[PDB]
Amino acid sequence: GLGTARLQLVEFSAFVEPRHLFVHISQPPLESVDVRQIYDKFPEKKGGLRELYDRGPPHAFFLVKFWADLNWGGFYGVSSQYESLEHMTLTCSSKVCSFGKQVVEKVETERAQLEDGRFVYRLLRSPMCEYLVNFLHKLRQLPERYMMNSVLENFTILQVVTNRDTQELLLCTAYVFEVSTSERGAQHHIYRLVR
Numbered sequence: 519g520l521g522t523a524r525l526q527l528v529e530f531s532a533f534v535e536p537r538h539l540f541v542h543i544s545q546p547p548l549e550s551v552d553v554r555q556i557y558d559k560f561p562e563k564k565g566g567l568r569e570l571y572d573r574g575p576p577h578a579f580f581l582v583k584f585w586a587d588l589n590w591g592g593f594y595g596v597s598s599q600y601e602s603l604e605h606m607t608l609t610c611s612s613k614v615c616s617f618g619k620q621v622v623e624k625v626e627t628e629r630a631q632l633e634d635g636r637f638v639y640r641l642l643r644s645p646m647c648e649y650l651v652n653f654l655h656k657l658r659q660l661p662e663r664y665m666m667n668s669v670l671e672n673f674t675i676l677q678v679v680t681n682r683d684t685q686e687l688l689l690c691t692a693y694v695f696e697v698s699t700s701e702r703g704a705q706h707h708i709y710r711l712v713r
């Protein structure tokens with residue numbers, strides 16, 4: 519799973535409804551990757567991946583590679599759902615990056631809600647920012663998939679989830695992107711980051 523003992527990702531989807539899913543994670547082993555590889559895809563300012571990874575802790579950091587589905591106005595949303603056994607309040611920071619420069623930072627809060635003997639954190643139908651909406655509209659008009667991938671080699675997302683009250687990092691996911699054919703549909707591969 520994408521998860522620690524303290525906080526587990528349960529579901530993540532980005533979508534349009536007039537429901538089409540661009541990406542979708544629903545929730546053994548897990549493979550690994552050297553963070554060293556992907557430092558250049560994120561800022562080296564504060565909120566840089568190298569910095570975050572230093573006294574991390576290490577086991578909190580994951581990489582997701584998405585093969586997205588661009589084959590569909592509208593409502594553009596992002597729904598995520600986490601869970602834990604501790605009652606917490608979460609700060610969720612999403613940083614969109616283009617050529618290793620941060621161009622968007624979205625910061626949200628969610629308090630634990632009791633359900634079926636555990637705590638769930640529901641950040642549902644958060645409206646996708648306008649930068650991504652326009653970017654997606656442009657991207658889908660490209661005539662070849664290899665062009666879309668070329669454009670996407672420069673585009674990344676860094677998602678940091680901290681315990682609001684203690685300021686401890688619970689989860690840090692790096693996201694990288696290509697597109698899929700409609701035939702194959704959306705896919706992802708969750709790795710762990712090591713050093």
Ligand SMILES: CCCCCCCCCCCCCC(=O)O
Nearest residue numbers: 532540586596612624645646647
């Ligand atoms: C090919 C890219 C597909 C787009 C998928 C969006 C990925 C997650 C969005 C990042 C977090 C929220 C951003 C926002 O609400 O502005």
